[PDB]
Amino acid sequence: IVEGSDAEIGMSPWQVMLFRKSPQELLCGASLISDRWVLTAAHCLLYPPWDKNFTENDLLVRIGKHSRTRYERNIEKISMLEKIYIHPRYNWRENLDRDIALMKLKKPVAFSDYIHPVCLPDRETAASLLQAGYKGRVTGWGNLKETGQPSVLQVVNLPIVERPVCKDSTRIRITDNMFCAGYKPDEGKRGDACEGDSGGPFVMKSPFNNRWYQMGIVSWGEGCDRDGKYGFYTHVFRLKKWIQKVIDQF
């Protein structure tokens, strides 16, 4: 996260770290959506251009964390993966369309002050809140600048951007399964996700019911915090029927 701040304790209790077993290193962010299901970006698990194709036994999820590198004894919980599910129409060849994946845990995680699931949006919450100018929140342990790493989880609030501005900022083909967020050059304020924040959540706090909803997944960008560029996020609600099909079937 570039130009963010340190998270407060328990500020993002749905935050998940995707962790490689060997070598031991951070792979991505993710989010907790129930006691057994974790949501992330498909490109965190499968990206053939970079020879990335992880299997369940390659990975762990670490839940309840604040510190990036410490083993947070008596606070964090580490879970093994039972199964990965990648969206069947995830487009790794072109533009990361439908950049979404689910991970089922081998055993349910116990909720605590530090571990708690986020809501997924319904149609009405998405329609009401996914509007240009409305701000969401992005969290992660990724890089602090494009070209180092944070001691603790970072947080930045960013406004959703008008779709024509998103489209006009890039040569990559944008789809309805994406939205973009970030400040414009003339707005002064700054901030973005960066490498290592992939797969983590873009959340909004509903003013109707005072609950946090995950509207996006950190998906892609061109650099980090560049003027005139914006971060792109998987549109969770647009893919929710697939999420529900997977959870209901498995």
Binding site: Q24, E25, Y71, I78, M80
Partner: peptide
């Protein structure tokens, strides 16, 4: 720079 995690999670 990651602190080693308990071996039980790597079995």
């Amino acid at each position: 720079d990651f602190e080693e995690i308990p071996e039980e999670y790597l079995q």
